[PDB]
RNA sequence: GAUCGAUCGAUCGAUCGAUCC
């Protein structure tokens, strides 16, 4: 039922001005856009109709709208529909949006439509309610909209604009560090979305704190292992993997200057990812001893990254979890290669296993951050049986990791798997919410506390400034309100023209295409794949090639995750047809009736013809050439 | 195919997670 403060926060947008109304709960917005829509649509007098717009982000929270404006919106006989991915196929949205009002379409949908040239004019519409409009910063479709929007409007025919409301929980700091960034940051995301007024709790502060998460912070400062002989074994390894595959690239140490690395950490990483892009594209005359020297350094390094992952995870969750994973991984690798270097490194990696599965199974090389995770989760269950827990990680290779450890450690049994009747959920983003824990991570039920459990002060620094930015975000909010309406949108006018003068500024022309006849080359395997003359793109987005010889280049592979996507069906997945290579170079997929196996420039290698060299790209819009458009009419 | 957030590294690049088409 409408209350008052639920007209507290709708009175400001009743007048016809665009708010940045912000609630810290999700019933409260639902309500406060239902009365906004009821009392927009019924202000309007006998001969003009509304076509209020509800732009949601994601599709729960579509279907949740939908479903709501569908029931609520039944007395009064509104036509509410909605559009997404699915629904967009073959369908006149042009007539769902002339013939309806309560259209709750999502963000992408209109910027395509918008791009292509159906609902030219964003005057059509009288009402827009931007869910979550923090987003609004860069590049979003919500950020496309208001483009739109502002072009439309500054450009100087700007006839029935319709309101852009905004309806989210959190204005957002951003990276401000002083109260005048934040300001400035409040005002370009107010003036992005186009409003003068922010509306917020002032007054029916009594009844706001009901129903509000209200956390507590708990951070607790752990210190890492000190036995690191896992450690130190898989450090060993990694060692003289290395040492042994700089027999064939000399030069390895000079491809990447960085750092002095350390086994273990992201650095490490990234430098195993620049010298295998520094690697791969060696460009030996031979043509036949290069393809197996980039096999063997992709090998090498693969089992290096993998090593490495297998520290990381080692230090974070158990070790049992970290040598499952590498056994997982050898095992899932040997039924795809049977080469000598594949040979050599499993027959090493099983020599090493005889003493890495003794050191797992001592009982005296326990992490002591699961410890203390153990032992608060044993006190938290002991205070109370029935607290639902949700546990943040930040890689998805622990959240089976920490799942298997609860399966596995007796100390703790009224613990359920949660993986995303369970009673704690392991997941990595975003119910009950009685107790969080940002488990090296950087709602009901009131009492609920956020545990906070990390091996640096960083993290604890990091936390503690978002509350500092936190705080001084609601100090901005609090100064914005005190100032007048007139000034404000002086201001932000000035701002939104600042940032359409910006925009129209890079505004990169349209590059000289290539000429050349170049062709790609597998990553791993370096084989002659198909030249740029045979492939072709679709949409500007997508990229296939129609050769016959292609065909038979790579082998199907069924699709562990087939869907479709607004233009294609996936069927299965193509990788490359060698003796022991099994890259992925593609997907394959159905656009109309054909099948095509579009391909990505990011698992390639670019050879030109005329001079040799071999560039490398990572999206398709870097990879400047002549882009021949899909016609169906070939084949 | 695009977008967002976090971390790291030299205005850019890598990894992770999520979202949409
Ligand atoms: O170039 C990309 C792209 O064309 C195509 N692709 C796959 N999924 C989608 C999608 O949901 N939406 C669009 N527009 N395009 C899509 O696949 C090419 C790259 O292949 P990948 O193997 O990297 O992608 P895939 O989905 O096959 O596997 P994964 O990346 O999720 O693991
Ligand atoms: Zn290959």
């Given at each position: 039922?409408?209350?008052?403060?639920?007209?507290?926060?709708?009175?400001?947008?009743?007048?016809?001005?665009?708010?940045?109304?912000?609630?810290?709960?999700?019933?409260?917005?639902?309500?406060?856009?239902?009365?906004?829509?009821?009392?927009?649509?019924?202000?309007?007098?006998?001969?003009?109709?509304?076509?209020?717009?509800?732009?949601?982000?994601?599709?729960?929270?579509?279907?949740?709208?939908?479903?709501?404006?569908?029931?609520?919106?039944?007395?009064?006989?509104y036509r509410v529909t909605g559009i997404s991915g699915a629904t967009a196929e073959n369908v006149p949205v042009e007539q769902i949006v002339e013939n309806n009002d309560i259209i709750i379409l999502t963000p992408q949908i209109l910027v395509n439509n918008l791009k292509k040239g159906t609902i030219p004019s964003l005057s059509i519409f009288t009402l827009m309610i931007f869910d979550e409009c923090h987003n609004t910063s860069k590049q979003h479709p919500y950020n496309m909209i208001m483009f739109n929007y502002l072009d439309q409007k500054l450009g100087g025919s700007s006839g029935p604009l319709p309101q852009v409301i905004g309806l989210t929980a959190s204005v957002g700091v951003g990276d401000a560090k002083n109260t005048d960034e934040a300001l400035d940051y409040i005002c370009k995301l107010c003036a992005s979305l186009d409003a003068s007024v922010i509306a917020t709790v002032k007054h029916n502060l009594e009844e706001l704190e009901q129903v509000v998460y209200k956390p507590q912070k708990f951070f607790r400062k752990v210190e890492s292992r000190i036995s690191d002989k896992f450690k130190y074994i898989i450090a060993q390894?990694?060692?003289?993997?290395?040492?042994?595959?700089?027999?064939?690239?000399?030069?390895?140490?000079?491809?990447?200057?960085?750092?002095?690395?350390?086994?273990?950490?992201?650095?490490?990483?990234?430098?195993?990812?620049?010298?295998?892009?520094?690697?791969?594209?060696?460009?030996?005359?031979?043509?036949?001893?290069?393809?197996?020297?980039?096999?063997?350094?992709?090998?090498?390094?693969?089992?290096?990254?993998?090593?490495?992952?297998?520290?990381?995870?080692?230090?974070?969750?158990?070790?049992?979890?970290?040598?499952?994973?590498?056994?997982?991984?050898?095992?899932?690798?040997?039924?795809?290669?049977?080469?000598?270097?594949?040979?050599?490194?499993?027959?090493?990696?099983?020599?090493?296993?005889?003493?890495?599965?003794?050191?797992?199974?001592?009982?005296?090389?326990?992490?002591?951050?699961?410890?203390?995770?153990?032992?608060?989760?044993?006190?938290?269950?002991?205070?109370?049986?029935?607290?639902?827990?949700?546990?943040?990680?930040?890689?998805?290779?622990?959240?089976?990791?920490?799942?298997?450890?609860?399966?596995?450690?007796?100390?703790?049994?009224?613990?359920?798997?949660?993986?995303?009747?369970?009673?704690?959920?392991?997941?990595?983003?975003?119910?009950?919410?009685?107790?969080?824990?940002?488990?090296?991570?950087?709602?009901?039920?009131?009492?609920?506390?956020?545990?906070?459990?990390?091996?640096?002060?960083?993290?604890?620094?990091?936390?503690?400034?978002?509350?500092?930015?936190?705080?001084?975000?609601?100090?901005?909010?609090?100064?914005?309100?005190?100032?007048?309406?007139?000034?404000?949108?002086?201001?932000?006018?000035?701002?939104?023209?600042?940032?359409?003068?910006?925009?129209?500024?890079?505004?990169?022309?349209?590059?000289?295409?290539?000429?050349?006849?170049?062709?790609?080359?597998?990553?791993?395997?370096?084989?002659?794949?198909?030249?740029?003359?045979?492939?072709?793109?679709?949409?500007?987005?997508?990229?296939?090639?129609?050769?016959?010889?292609?065909?038979?280049?790579?082998?199907?592979?069924?699709?562990?995750?087939?869907?479709?996507?607004?233009?294609?069906?996936?069927?299965?997945?193509?990788?490359?047809?060698?003796?022991?290579?099994?890259?992925?170079?593609?997907?394959?997929?159905?656009?109309?009736?054909?099948?095509?196996?579009?391909?990505?420039?990011?698992?390639?290698?670019?050879?030109?013809?005329?001079?040799?060299?071999?560039?490398?790209?990572?999206?398709?819009?870097?990879?400047?050439?002549?882009?021949?458009?899909?016609?169906?009419?070939?084949?």
């Amino acid at each position: 039922k409408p209350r008052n403060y639920q007209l507290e926060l709708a009175l400001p947008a009743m007048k016809g001005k665009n708010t940045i109304i912000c609630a810290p709960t999700g019933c409260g917005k639902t309500f406060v856009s239902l009365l906004i829509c009821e009392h927009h649509l019924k202000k309007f007098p006998q001969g003009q109709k509304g076509k209020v717009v509800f732009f949601a982000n994601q599709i729960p929270v579509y279907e949740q709208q939908k479903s709501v404006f569908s029931k609520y919106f039944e007395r009064h006989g509104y036509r509410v529909t909605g559009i997404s991915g699915a629904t967009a196929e073959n369908v006149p949205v042009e007539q769902i949006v002339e013939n309806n009002d309560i259209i709750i379409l999502t963000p992408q949908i209109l910027v395509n439509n918008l791009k292509k040239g159906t609902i030219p004019s964003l005057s059509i519409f009288t009402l827009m309610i931007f869910d979550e409009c923090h987003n609004t910063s860069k590049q979003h479709p919500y950020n496309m909209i208001m483009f739109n929007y502002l072009d439309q409007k500054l450009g100087g025919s700007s006839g029935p604009l319709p309101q852009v409301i905004g309806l989210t929980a959190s204005v957002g700091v951003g990276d401000a560090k002083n109260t005048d960034e934040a300001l400035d940051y409040i005002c370009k995301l107010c003036a992005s979305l186009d409003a003068s007024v922010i509306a917020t709790v002032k007054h029916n502060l009594e009844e706001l704190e009901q129903v509000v998460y209200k956390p507590q912070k708990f951070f607790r400062k752990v210190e890492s292992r000190i036995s690191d002989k896992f450690k130190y074994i898989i450090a060993q390894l990694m060692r003289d993997t290395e040492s042994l595959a700089k027999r064939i690239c000399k030069d390895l140490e000079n491809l990447s200057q960085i750092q002095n690395r350390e086994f273990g950490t992201q650095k490490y990483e990234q430098w195993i990812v620049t010298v295998q892009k520094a690697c791969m594209v060696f460009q030996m005359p031979d043509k036949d001893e290069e393809s197996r020297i980039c096999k063997a350094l992709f090998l090498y390094t693969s089992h290096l990254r993998k090593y490495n992952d297998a520290l990381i995870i080692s230090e974070h969750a158990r070790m049992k979890d970290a040598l499952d994973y590498l056994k997982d991984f050898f095992s899932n690798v040997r039924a795809a290669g049977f080469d000598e270097i594949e040979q050599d490194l499993t027959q090493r990696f099983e020599e090493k296993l005889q003493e890495l599965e003794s050191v797992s199974r001592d009982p005296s090389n326990e992490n002591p951050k699961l410890e203390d995770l153990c032992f608060i989760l044993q006190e938290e269950y002991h205070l109370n049986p029935e607290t639902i827990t949700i546990l943040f990680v930040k890689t998805r290779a622990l959240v089976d990791a920490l799942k298997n450890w609860i399966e596995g450690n007796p100390k703790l049994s009224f613990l359920k798997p949660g993986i995303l009747d369970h009673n704690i959920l392991i997941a990595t983003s975003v119910a009950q919410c009685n107790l969080v824990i940002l488990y090296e991570y950087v709602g009901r039920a009131r009492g609920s506390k956020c545990f906070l459990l990390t091996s640096n002060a960083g993290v604890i620094e990091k936390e503690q400034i978002n509350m500092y930015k936190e705080k001084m975000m609601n100090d901005s909010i609090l100064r914005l309100q005190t100032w007048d309406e007139a000034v404000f949108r002086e201001k932000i006018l000035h701002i939104q023209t600042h940032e359409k003068f910006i925009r129209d500024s890079q505004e990169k022309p349209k590059p000289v295409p290539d000429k050349e006849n170049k062709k790609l080359l597998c990553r791993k395997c370096k084989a002659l794949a198909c030249y740029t003359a045979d492939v072709r793109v679709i949409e500007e987005c997508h990229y296939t090639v129609l050769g016959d010889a292609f065909k038979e280049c790579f082998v199907s592979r069924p699709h562990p995750k087939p869907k479709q996507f607004s233009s294609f069906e996936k069927r299965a997945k193509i990788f490359c047809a060698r003796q022991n290579c099994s890259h992925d170079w593609g997907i394959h997929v159905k656009y109309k009736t054909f099948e095509i196996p579009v391909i990505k420039i990011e698992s390639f290698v670019v050879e030109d013809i005329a001079t040799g060299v071999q560039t490398l790209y990572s999206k398709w819009k870097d990879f400047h050439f002549e882009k021949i458009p899909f016609d169906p009419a070939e084949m």
